[PDB]
């Protein structure tokens, strides 16, 4: 079992030749590659290189594959050494992964001279000046669609209709109040105009992206595309629903569904996430914190039921009890544990107040336990980008 | 900036939901979505004055979520700032 | 245990001061020191329902201090607990 001496800038290392022959494609494992570094006067291979790194390089052979970077050695210096000793692409990949680096993909255009041209200014805002323009306009349209959706609820506008003084219930007024705007081919309502324009553009982007994208299979997998769709679904579904129930009795029978889709319109806010690095980071953060986010909700649930129950019974024998039932106390318990404390429900008895005191303290600890982990994940994804 | 931005997103999201959830109530404390912005900020920062509160079951579910969302929203960017200060 | 203990100390200390500070007011919301315990806990944990509030200048100075003291009181032992959990 012939021994080999490797001198790293004066620091002496020794191993068995069979330990190095284990990996024939590396510098040290290949006689022809290491020949260049042999000093026949001293019977050693000499490398005028970084010292703190070699330990791990040699341990990789002794361990049979373990490549751990020493805590005291910078990742950029170590990786250069892994490359120098020619440990190979597999070890390198295993290293980066374990080091917290895994990326890989990129679907370019089909090389259509057309598709690749359209796709570049509809997803890569830096591809060109026009690309930016499209992105800027997209943000403006999103912001406008939000402001408009909100103004639809202002009394100055909605409180001005055919039955604003409790007179009747006009079918056109009843659906205009439910939907938020007047749907008519005449386009009299400025709100319907703004909403239609905005949805024309959202519809445009979604279409242009669906036909200029390299793959149509990994499309409805991208959360961004899902968002793009959700942003237009309400509009078209409302049209369909109103035209399929064009009578007072019918509409009244589908109003709940119509209302649900009106609320869904606010999800268009998330369209900004395509232009917000932070919103993307937040997204990555939440995806990685599902477990802790679940514990948060779970512990809060336990505390809510526990405290709601106790305060309910503690106030039960009082004529002025502010707790009609345990389920109703859930509200008070959440408002107390999160320390919001509106004051619309409060215990009035000594036992209720002892329960409330505990409820508050329990809330602070309950929330405090899982949050830090989430904050940590965010801090990680946040700097990894910064 | 992220703090203000995330809070803005949450404010609009929660103001919208609570508004519609209380809309069909004669005693609704939310005249419009923009007016609910106040309640949403007061809840997310956990101030909770109590001058505007939901009264329906759907409004209270929205409010509960709004409070929890506020704690996490603020909690995410602050630590970095605290670090810079330190 | 330290959490509960420090809170207890602060509760009694602040309940006492606010009680005496509001004592000479016909509309005092603090019937006795033990009754003020409630207000002091609700303030130190920053819940702030608003069902009991000081109305005098001295009561409000006491209340201001009570709130700040609460934040530091809770903040001291919690981190350790959060650490054990982590
Ligand atoms: C509420 C908030 C919703 C927020 C939605 C945010 C959506 C964010 C969508 C998005 O861009 O995700 C991409 C990764 O996608 C992915 O792996 C897929 C991630 C899916 C996350 C789904 C979260 C759902 C949350 C419910 C980013 O990749 P990229 O290489 O540019 O990163 C580079 C970076 O790490 C700096 O080097
Ligand atoms: K608070
Ligand atoms: K509060
Ligand atoms: K409060
Ligand atoms: K209050």
Q: Which of A365, A371, A373, A376 to mutate to test the interface with C (most CBs of C within 10 A)?
A: A365
Token pair recorded at residue A86: 């020619």
Instruction: Give the whole-angstrom CA distance, residue B40 versus residue B13.
Output: 9
Phi, psi at A6, each rounded to 5°: -120, 120
In chain C, DSSP finds a helix count (H) and a strand count (E) of 4, 0
**Assigned token pair, A150:** 């909100």
What does A4-34 look like in DSSP terms, one character per residue? EEEEETTEEEEEEHHHHTTSTTSTTT-HHHH
Domain A1-101, second-level architecture: 2-Layer Sandwich (3.30)
Atom of ligand 1 nearest to the CA of A277: 11
Report yes or no: A155 at the B interface, CB cutoff 8 Å: yes
CB contacts < 8 Å between A and C, how many?
50
Resolution in A, one decimal? Answer: 2.4
User: Which atom of ligand 1 lies closest to the CA of B9?
Assistant: 1
Ligand 1 pocket test: pick from A268, A283, A380 the residue with the most ligand atoms within 8 Å of its Cβ: A283
Contact A276, B8 (CB under 8 A): no
Phi/psi at A343 (5° precision): 95, 10
Q: Would you call A336 and C47 a contact, using CB atoms and an 8 Å cutoff?
A: yes
What share of residues in chain A are helix, strand, coil (percent, to 5)?
Answer: 60, 5, 35
What is the C-alpha to C-alpha distance for residues C20 and C25, in angstroms, rounded to an integer?
A: 10
CA A128 – ligand 3 centroid, Å: 49
- Which H/E stretch holds residue B61? helix B57-75
- Nearest residue CA, atom 37 of ligand 1? A385
Asked if B74 has any chain A CB less than 8 Å from its own CB, the reply is no
Relative orientation angle of helices A190-212 and A233-243, to the nearest 10 degrees:
120
Helical H segments across A152-189, by residue range: 155-158, 171-179
Residue A280, min C-alpha distance to chain C (Å): 26
Superfamily, domain A113-275: Voltage-gated potassium channels. Chain C (1.20.120.350)
**C48 in reach of chain B (CB within 8 A):** yes
List the shell of residues around ion ligand 3, using CB closer than 5 Å: A 341; B 48; C 48
Q: Pick one of 1.10.287.70, 3.10.20.600, 1.20.140.10, 3.40.1020.10 as the CATH number of C1-86.
A: 1.10.287.70
Domain A276-386 CATH class label: mainly alpha
Tell whether C9 lies on the interface with A, counting CB pairs under 8 A. Answer: no
Domain parsing of chain B, residue ranges: 1-86
């Amino acid at each position: 079992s012939e021994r080999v001496v490797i001198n790293i800038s004066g620091l002496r290392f020794e191993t068995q030749l069979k330990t190095l022959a284990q990996f024939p494609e590396t510098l040290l494992g290949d006689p022809k590659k290491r020949m260049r570094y042999f000093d026949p006067l001293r019977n050693e291979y000499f490398f005028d290189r970084n010292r703190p790194s070699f330990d791990a390089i040699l341990y990789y052979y002794q361990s049979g594959g373990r490549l751990r970077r020493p805590v005291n050695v910078p990742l950029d210096i170590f990786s250069e050494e892994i490359r120098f000793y020619e440990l190979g692409e597999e070890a390198m990949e295993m290293f980066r992964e374990d080091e917290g680096y895994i990326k890989e993909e990129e679907r370019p255009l089909p090389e259509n001279e057309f598709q690749r041209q359209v796709w570049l200014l509809f997803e890569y805002p830096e591809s060109s000046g026009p690309a930016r323009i499209i992105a800027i306009v997209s943000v403006m349209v999103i912001l406008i669609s939000i402001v408009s959706f909100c103004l639809e609820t202002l009394p100055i506008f909605r409180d001005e209709n055919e039955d604003m003084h409790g007179g009747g219930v006009t079918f056109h007024t009843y659906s205009q109040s439910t939907i938020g705007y007047q749907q008519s081919t005449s386009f009299t309502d400025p709100f319907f105009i703004v909403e239609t324009l905005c949805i024309i553009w959202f519809s445009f982007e979604f279409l242009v992206r669906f036909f200029a994208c390299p793959s149509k299979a990994g499309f409805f997998t991208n959360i961004m595309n899902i968002i793009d769709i959700v942003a237009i679904i309400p509009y078209y579904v409302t049209i369909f629903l109103t035209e399929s129930n064009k009578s007072v009795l019918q509409f009244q029978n589908v109003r709940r569904v119509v209302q649900i889709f009106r609320i869904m319109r606010i999800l268009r806010i998330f369209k900004l996430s395509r232009h917000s690095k932070g919103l993307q980071i937040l997204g990555q953060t939440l995806k990685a914190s599902m477990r802790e986010l679940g514990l948060l909700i779970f512990f809060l649930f336990i505390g809510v039921i526990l405290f709601s129950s106790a305060v309910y019974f503690a106030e039960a024998d009082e004529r002025d009890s502010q707790f009609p039932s345990i389920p109703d106390a859930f509200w008070w318990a959440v408002v107390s544990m999160t320390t919001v404390g509106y004051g619309d429900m409060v215990p009035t008895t000594i036992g209720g107040k002892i329960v409330g005191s505990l409820c508050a303290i329990a809330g602070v600890l309950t929330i405090a336990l899982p949050v830090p982990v989430i904050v940590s994940n965010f801090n990680y994804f946040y700097h990894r980008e910064t």
